[PDB]
Amino acid sequence: KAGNWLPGSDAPAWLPDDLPGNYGFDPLSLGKEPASLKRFTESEVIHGRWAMLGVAGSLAVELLGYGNWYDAPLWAVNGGKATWFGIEVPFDLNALLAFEFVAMAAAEGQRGDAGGVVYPGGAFDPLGFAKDSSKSGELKLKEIKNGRLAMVAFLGFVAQHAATGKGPIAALGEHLANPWGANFATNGISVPFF
Amino acid sequence: KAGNWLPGSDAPAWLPDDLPGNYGFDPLSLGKEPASLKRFTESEVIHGRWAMLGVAGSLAVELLGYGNWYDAPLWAVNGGKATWFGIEVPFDLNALLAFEFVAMAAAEGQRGDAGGVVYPGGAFDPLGFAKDSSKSGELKLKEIKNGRLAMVAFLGFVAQHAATGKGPIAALGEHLANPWGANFATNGISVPFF
Amino acid sequence: DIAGLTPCSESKAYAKLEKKELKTLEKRLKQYEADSAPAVALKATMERTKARFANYAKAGLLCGNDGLPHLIADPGLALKYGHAGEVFIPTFGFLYVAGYIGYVGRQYLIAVKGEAKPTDKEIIIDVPLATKLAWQGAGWPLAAVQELQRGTLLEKEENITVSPR
Amino acid sequence: DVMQAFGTPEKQILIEPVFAQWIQAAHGKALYGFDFLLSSKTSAAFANGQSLWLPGWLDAINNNQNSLFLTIGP
Amino acid sequence: RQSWLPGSQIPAHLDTPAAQALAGNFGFDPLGLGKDPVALRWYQQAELIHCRTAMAGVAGILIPGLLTKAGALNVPEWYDAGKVAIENSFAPWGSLLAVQLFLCGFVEAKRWQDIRKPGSQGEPGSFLGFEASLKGTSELGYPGGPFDPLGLSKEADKWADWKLKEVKNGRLAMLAFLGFVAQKYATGAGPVDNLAAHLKDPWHVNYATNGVSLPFL
Amino acid sequence: LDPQIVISGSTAAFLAIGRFVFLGYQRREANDDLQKNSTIFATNDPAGFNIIDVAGWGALGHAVGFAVLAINSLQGANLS
Amino acid sequence: NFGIGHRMQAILEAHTPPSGSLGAGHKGLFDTVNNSLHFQLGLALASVGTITSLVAQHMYSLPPYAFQAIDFTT
Ligand code: CHL
Numbered sequence: 001k002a003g004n005w006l007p008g009s010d011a012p013a014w015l016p017d018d019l020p021g022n023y024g025f026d027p028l029s030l031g032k033e034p035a036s037l038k039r040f041t042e043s044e045v046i047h048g049r050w051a052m053l054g055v056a057g058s059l060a061v062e063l064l065g066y067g068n069w070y071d072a073p074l075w076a077v078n079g080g081k082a083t084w085f086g087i088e089v090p091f092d093l094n095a096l097l098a099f100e101f102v103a104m105a106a107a108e109g110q111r112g113d114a115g116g117v118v119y120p121g122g123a124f125d126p127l128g129f130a131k132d133s134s135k136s137g138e139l140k141l142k143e144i145k146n147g148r149l150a151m152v153a154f155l156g157f158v159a160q161h162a163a164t165g166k167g168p169i170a171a172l173g174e175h176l177a178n179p180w181g182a183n184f185a186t187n188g189i190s191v192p193f194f
Numbered sequence: 195k196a197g198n199w200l201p202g203s204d205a206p207a208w209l210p211d212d213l214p215g216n217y218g219f220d221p222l223s224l225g226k227e228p229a230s231l232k233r234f235t236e237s238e239v240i241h242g243r244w245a246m247l248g249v250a251g252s253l254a255v256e257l258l259g260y261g262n263w264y265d266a267p268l269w270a271v272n273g274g275k276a277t278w279f280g281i282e283v284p285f286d287l288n289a290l291l292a293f294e295f296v297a298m299a300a301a302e303g304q305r306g307d308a309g310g311v312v313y314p315g316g317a318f319d320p321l322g323f324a325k326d327s328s329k330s331g332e333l334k335l336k337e338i339k340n341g342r343l344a345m346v347a348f349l350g351f352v353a354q355h356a357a358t359g360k361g362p363i364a365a366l367g368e369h370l371a372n373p374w375g376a377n378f379a380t381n382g383i384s385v386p387f388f
Numbered sequence: 389d390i391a392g393l394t395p396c397s398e399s400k401a402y403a404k405l406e407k408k409e410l411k412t413l414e415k416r417l418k419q420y421e422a423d424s425a426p427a428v429a430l431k432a433t434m435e436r437t438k439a440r441f442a443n444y445a446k447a448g449l450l451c452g453n454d455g456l457p458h459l460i461a462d463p464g465l466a467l468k469y470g471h472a473g474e475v476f477i478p479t480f481g482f483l484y485v486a487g488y489i490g491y492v493g494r495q496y497l498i499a500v501k502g503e504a505k506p507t508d509k510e511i512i513i514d515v516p517l518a519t520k521l522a523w524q525g526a527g528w529p530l531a532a533v534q535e536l537q538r539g540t541l542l543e544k545e546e547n548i549t550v551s552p553r
Numbered sequence: 554d555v556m557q558a559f560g561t562p563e564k565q566i567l568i569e570p571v572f573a574q575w576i577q578a579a580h581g582k583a584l585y586g587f588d589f590l591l592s593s594k595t596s597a598a599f600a601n602g603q604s605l606w607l608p609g610w611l612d613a614i615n616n617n618q619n620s621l622f623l624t625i626g627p
Numbered sequence: 628r629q630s631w632l633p634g635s636q637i638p639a640h641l642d643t644p645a646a647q648a649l650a651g652n653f654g655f656d657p658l659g660l661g662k663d664p665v666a667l668r669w670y671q672q673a674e675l676i677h678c679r680t681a682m683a684g685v686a687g688i689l690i691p692g693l694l695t696k697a698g699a700l701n702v703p704e705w706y707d708a709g710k711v712a713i714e715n716s717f718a719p720w721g722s723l724l725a726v727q728l729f730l731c732g733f734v735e736a737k738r739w740q741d742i743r744k745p746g747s748q749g750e751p752g753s754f755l756g757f758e759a760s761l762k763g764t765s766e767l768g769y770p771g772g773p774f775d776p777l778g779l780s781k782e783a784d785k786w787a788d789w790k791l792k793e794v795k796n797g798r799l800a801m802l803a804f805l806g807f808v809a810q811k812y813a814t815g816a817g818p819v820d821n822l823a824a825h826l827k828d829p830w831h832v833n834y835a836t837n838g839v840s841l842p843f844l
Numbered sequence: 845l846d847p848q849i850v851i852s853g854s855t856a857a858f859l860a861i862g863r864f865v866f867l868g869y870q871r872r873e874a875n876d877d878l879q880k881n882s883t884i885f886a887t888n889d890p891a892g893f894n895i896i897d898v899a900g901w902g903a904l905g906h907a908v909g910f911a912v913l914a915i916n917s918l919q920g921a922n923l924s
Numbered sequence: 925n926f927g928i929g930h931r932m933q934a935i936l937e938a939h940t941p942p943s944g945s946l947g948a949g950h951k952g953l954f955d956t957v958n959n960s961l962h963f964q965l966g967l968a969l970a971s972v973g974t975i976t977s978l979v980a981q982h983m984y985s986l987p988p989y990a991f992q993a994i995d996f997t998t
Pocket residue numbers: 629630631632633634653655
């Protein structure tokens with residue numbers, strides 16, 4: 001058990017102790033049925049892995065000076081052209097949709113057939129970090145914890161942008177400049193009567 | 195069984211469990227008579243197969259840039275000349291009717307004598323995908339589901355054209371431009387009181 | 389407008405009809421004195437006449453070439469052009485009252501068929517029982533549906549007498 | 554009759570035969586203003602027959618001096 | 628035995644153990660609408676849905692109205708909000724309503740099928756693993772599960788009291804909305820305006836003097 | 845349209861389908877002295893196609909053939 | 925006598941809805957109609973009787989004879 005989400009509470013019986021990232025958090029009892037929990041366990045890791053790529057990508061674009069995550073696709077609607085690290089990409093929106101749909105369908109179709117294989121290893125573990133079973137326990141916990149953090153972080157990007165309209169790096173700079181005058185309570189939307 | 199169309203309901207007893215595409219959907223109990231169901235089973239596949247070709251033909255013409263499905267036969271009424279992929283076809287309307295009636299009568303007459311056979315195989319399955327007949331259950335489900343979707347799509351083409359008068363691809367572009375301002379609820383036709 | 393009709397408020401024949409009706413009363417009013425009872429009665433009729441023509445025009449009735457209001461019965465036309473109060477709304481007013489009467493009578497008939505002498509309760513009304521059923525008939529549309537859904541509204545064919553065929 | 558007897562013809566119940574007038578409009582009678590099918594010059598039915606028989610039929614049905622689909626009312 | 632009318636004869640169909648287990652049973656059914664046990668079960672569901680919708684609706688009229696009077700917010704009258712909102716909206720009301728019917732129709736259908744076969748929406752495989760949470764509880768109209776995030780229903784010693792409070796406030800909210808509709812036509816002002824006008828001069832500003840409710844007087 | 849090719853073509857088409865396509869279907873569906881089939885119209889045709897069938901399918905061909913000629917003749921007509 | 929065409933009895937026996945909504949359907953009606961002169965006369969009168977009304981309704985509105993419309997008495 002990683003820990004307890006609510007000190008003084010009792011962990012649900014249906015959450016296995018060995019399950020990585022198990023803090024006994026299921027107030028709605030969504031994972032009570034074993035079949036439902038099996039699907040949700042895979043879905044959480046898949047969400048976390050995408051969020052980690054999504055958050056890392058969102059920060060890299062703005063840190064390197066190519067804009068924020070929100071304005072990246074505007075070229076496809078304003079008649080512009082795609083760029084990657086500044087170099088033009090000849091493809092257009094229609095071509096991108098077709099290639100992405102085919103590429104993802106083939107890749108996600110293969111994963112779907114495997115039947116909920118969260119940790120395949122092999123070709124996906126070239127360096128063999130998770131080759132050993134004993135060490136894999138801690139690494140799985142680190143993956144799910146960083147993954148849960150990334151999911152929350154991306155929700156922060158989306159919520160913060162809607163309220164303020166700025167990028168995640170710009171928001172961090174604004175908060176650091178005037179911490180007490182730039183926060184969620186002063187954006188005029190998060191807290192109503194102000 | 196493919197599934198349940200109305201979660202929590204009971205499948206009608208007259209729909210056998212091994213019938214392809216059996217979601218237990220028969221609220222009017224049209225298939226209650228075993229002899230009627232046998233004809234319906236054959237007819238559904240035939241309608242689906244024609245609809246799959248019809249929808250593909252309707253979409254292919256407009257995507258490639260030869261008008262929409264509705265305007266295809268206008269040449270036979272305005273004194274024009276038939277074209278196919280931009281290649282003029284020497285035949286005129288009266289000649290076309292003769293070829294189609296004779297050909298379809300021969301082919302459909304042959305199928306009728308077969309006695310309600312829906313999966314001929316043999317000459318009609320040159321690559322032998324369903325030759326095994328063991329894994330054919332999955333393929334038959336895919337055929338019926340794609341066929342049902344094609345039938346619904348084609349009715350969508352006819353209904354949408356009768357309401358807005360645009361081609362299916364043109365209508366899709368109209369919806370994407372203004373999803374909330376261009377839909378069935380804004381035709382002025384589908385819902386009179388909107 | 390609908391079916392070639394015109395609004396009564398815009399109809400020359402409709403306006404002319406009101407003048408003739410008032411003119412007929414005015415002629416009779418000449419032979420009576422100002423304070424006499426016949427004069428008061430005639431003027432009261434005149435006020436009612438003017439109100440009537442004012443109200444029908446206000447309600448938006450369509451008038452024919454004759455200048456008389458014409459009703460619209462198709463629900464679509466009535467609801468599209470604001471004539472629902474002519475036939476459509478009155479339709480459901482009647483069916484509520486008519487079913488009320490029918491449902492209350494049916495309840496009384498069924499109630500007294502369990503008595504020792506059912507026919508005596510049909511010529512000498514059980515007024516206390518009849519009165520109770522009358523008040524409870526306001527919910528007949530709900531009660532009737534429940535019997536229809538429960539299969540108790542209708543009797544089974546095996547219990548109904550028929551002639552040889 | 555009672556409304557007529559009491560000298561109030563405006564209080565009588567006069568229900569327009571809209572269902573029948575609608576059918577007459579469908580046949581090309583332009584009096585009622587429904588304007589669809591043969592009463593609508595932009596309909597396919599009006600256009601397709603415009604070279605065979607509609608000119609003669611439409612001339613006859615819109616003449617109120619004959620018996621071809623007489624005007625109807627309450 | 629609490630009754631809506633002390634000393635009246637409680638209907639027999641409301642004195643059964645099943646009927647007395649319903650929340651808010653005060654023996655009130657003069658029309659005998661719930662005499663059939665199957666119908667009473669359906670009408671109990673209808674009352675809960677009306678109660679909960681009326682409570683949300685009345686709170687969406689009264690709280691914004693009171694804050695608007697206090698100046699905290701600036702919200703139009705409940706009977707004018709639809710027009711004001713649609714002018715500044717991203718969709719026409721027709722497309723907005725159509726989407727609402729699709730979304731409401733889906734959840735209402737699932738609730739409908741649960742009334743007919745309680746617990747049937749937990750059919751394995753029907754929903755993408757979520758059907759386990761759609762079985763509801765042993766009582767119809769109290770789904771719990773994801774619908775009760777704080778788990779207040781799990782407290783057995785407080786369960787009967789929670790249900791009575793819901794139905795009591797729900798019945799009050801329904802009459803409040805009917806009051807809003809009637810007062811809009813009678814006075815042509817907002818609900819809080821009506822309250823202020825009554826408090827200013829209670830003995831001369833009420834329904835007996837609005838010129839509509841009592842025409843004979 | 846030339847009448848000979850249209851009428852001959854339609855007649856040929858309807859005789860072919862009646863002999864090669866629908867002959868079997870027709871036979872299955874098909875299967876005081878003035879009411880008896882006294883004369884059996886025997887034929888030497890391998891498939892049983894006899895004179896009565898020739899008259900039937902031939903009649904349909906002629907009827908359909910003239911319909912094509914009549915409909916086409918309207919195009920380009922005056923006062924009609 | 926030429927081995928082609930329909931047998932009327934065959935047609936009637938075939939038209940029986942599969943669901944049993946019309947029971948045995950039209951079984952036995954060939955003999956019933958064919959053996960009853962009163963069934964035949966009833967059908968003939970009903971058909972001719974309706975046709976006579978059609979003649980009345982169409983001849984006044986679509987007069988086939990020259991100068992018929994102006995002869996009001998006729
Ligand atoms: C379903 C709804 C319902 C209905 C229609 C009734 C109807 C009735 N109840 Mg019943 N009750 C109902 C629910 C309930 N009742 C009760 C408990 C009681 C009791 C204890 C009694 C009744 C009684 C009565 C009758 C009163 C007759 C009358 O003219 O009163 C006239 C009405 C009034 C005087 C009230 C008017 C209030 C006014 C509209 C509001 C004014 C508020 C202002 C702030 C005042 C201004 C300030 C002041 C200082 C000037 C009446 C038939 C009485 C009776 O006769 O029983 C035999 C009775 O004793 N009911 C409960 C709790 C269990 C109910 C719960 O739902």
